[PDB]
Design a protein around this ligand. Sequence first.
Ligand SMILES: Nc1nc2c(ncn2[C@@H]2O[C@@H]3COP(=O)(O)O[C@H]4[C@@H](O)[C@H](n5cnc6c(=O)[nH]c(N)nc65)O[C@@H]4COP(=O)(O)O[C@H]3[C@H]2O)c(=O)[nH]1
Ligand SMILES: [Mg+2]
Ligand SMILES: [Mg+2]
Length: 90
Amino acid sequence: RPNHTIYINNLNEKIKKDELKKSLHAIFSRFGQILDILVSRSLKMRGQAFVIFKEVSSATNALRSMQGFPFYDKPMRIQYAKTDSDIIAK
RNA sequence: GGUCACGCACAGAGCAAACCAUUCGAAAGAGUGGGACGCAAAGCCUCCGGCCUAAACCAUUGCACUCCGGUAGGUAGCGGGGUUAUCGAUGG
Ligand SMILES: Nc1nc2c(ncn2[C@@H]2O[C@@H]3COP(=O)(O)O[C@H]4[C@@H](O)[C@H](n5cnc6c(=O)[nH]c(N)nc65)O[C@@H]4COP(=O)(O)O[C@H]3[C@H]2O)c(=O)[nH]1
Ligand SMILES: [Mg+2]
Ligand SMILES: [Mg+2]
């Protein structure tokens, strides 16, 4: 089940697209060298964000730590992505 | 000469993009002053599509890498259409 990418949801939708990005960068670069962190507030993909890592070990490292984490007045919910990013799917 | 189309001109006259100053706005943006990229309606109207915005209100717990909720504002200089209008090539 493990993956390069981790899926977080139940985040605060009020937070700006670009603010939410830089928010997660400093808090998750604590585990690896993040490739890219795709987020949008579009109806389907709002309140949620994907974290693409260079190492899977670093993604696993980040996962088994911060589940249920209060972050911008909201519990954070980590779980691996099922299908990788187009940057990794090759 | 009207009416409706057309724009290769004359001739007069009209707005005014970027930028900057300043105010209103969360923002997109708009207003005025300066400025002139262009414009045959770059006069005006959000009715049809698109794009830009997302502060609040309701909507949503959602696995993306075409994008994509409502609502609301914006854009007429994004097209579409409605309406008003100037010149008049021995002009069609
Ligand atoms: N009086 C009058 N003359 C017309 C008309 N249509 C064409 N012309 C003449 O033919 C030229 C070509 O017009 P254009 O290709 O649309 O190209 C034009 C046009 O796109 C624009 N322009 C100039 N004046 C105006 C205006 O008052 N309103 C608008 N919307 N555009 C203008 O600048 C360009 C060159 O300027 P011009 O010296 O006017 O150059 C014009 C003008 O001399 C019209 O409806 N009325
Ligand atoms: Mg002229
Ligand atoms: Mg208007």
